[PDB]
Ligand binder design. Structure first.
Ligand SMILES: COC(=O)c1c(O)cc(O)c(Cl)c1CCc1ccccc1Cc1ccc(F)cc1
Length: 217
């Protein structure tokens, strides 16, 4: 139920960290493209699958902050992940390179983390804990949880609430407090959604103050 990160993931996690202490806001870029990739993969799958979109009809990205409890959620209706994918895809880096890329890191690292798809780990730049809730079309909903010193994957007590897709939940660090106010999340979401192909919304105030989803691109 508990697991240890692979050694290179630790080396990578530190390399991502002490190289982008200055460009902290790139985590939201990497979470938004990581959602698009996931949303693509299910649109591809839906070409050859009469029922790939059973678990959820829509293909969106929904971002919700939560200043009262210090949380940022980024939820896509993409392909989702299984228990085993959670453990392997997020507990290992072995897809290609995986040691090749840690030379050139230490050898303006903002571009290169995106190139290699390891952008997920920039989340630890602003989070004390990172929580991945995900639902694949061939598995039950699971939760992945880590503070970088280990992680655990558990079945979700709540059943299937996602339909299909993934939530990234960040328990934000204290310094990162400004990513909890509307206007500055919307700000960064616009800057990084310009070329994403799916609609991206932000639970927002259009004041009698009322909250609906607000589209950003
Ligand atoms: C499909 O995934 C999502 O649902 C999703 C999603 O829907 C939104 C997201 O923000 C993320 Cl991160 C995912 C998971 C992305 C993913 C998915 C599969 C493999 C790897 C990766 C990232 C990764 C992790 C560790 C590495 F070493 C390299 C890359």
């Amino acid at each position: 139920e508990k697991f240890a990160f692979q050694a290179e993931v630790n080396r990578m996690m530190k390399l991502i960290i002490n190289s982008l202490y200055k460009n902290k806001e790139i985590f939201l870029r990497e979470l938004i493209s990581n959602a698009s990739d996931a949303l693509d993969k299910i649109r591809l799958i839906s070409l050859t699958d009469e029922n790939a979109l059973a678990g959820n009809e829509e293909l969106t990205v929904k971002i919700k902050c939560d200043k009262e409890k210090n949380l940022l959620h980024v939820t896509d209706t993409g392909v989702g992940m299984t228990r085993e994918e959670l453990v392997k895809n997020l507990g290992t880096i072995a897809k290609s390179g995986t040691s090749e890329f840690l030379n050139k890191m230490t050898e303006s690292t903002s571009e290169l983390i995106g190139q290699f798809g390891v952008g997920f780990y920039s989340a630890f730049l602003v989070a004390d804990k990172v929580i991945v809730t995900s639902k694949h079309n061939n598995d039950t909903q699971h939760i992945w949880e880590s503070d970088s010193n280990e992680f655990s994957v558990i079945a979700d007590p709540r059943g299937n609430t996602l339909g299909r897709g993934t939530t990234i939940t960040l328990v934000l660090k204290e310094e990162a407090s400004d990513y909890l106010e509307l206007d500055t999340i919307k700000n960064l979401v616009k800057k990084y959604s310009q070329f994403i192909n799916f609609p991206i919304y932000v639970w927002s105030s259009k004041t009698k103050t009322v909250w609906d989803w607000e589209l950003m691109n």
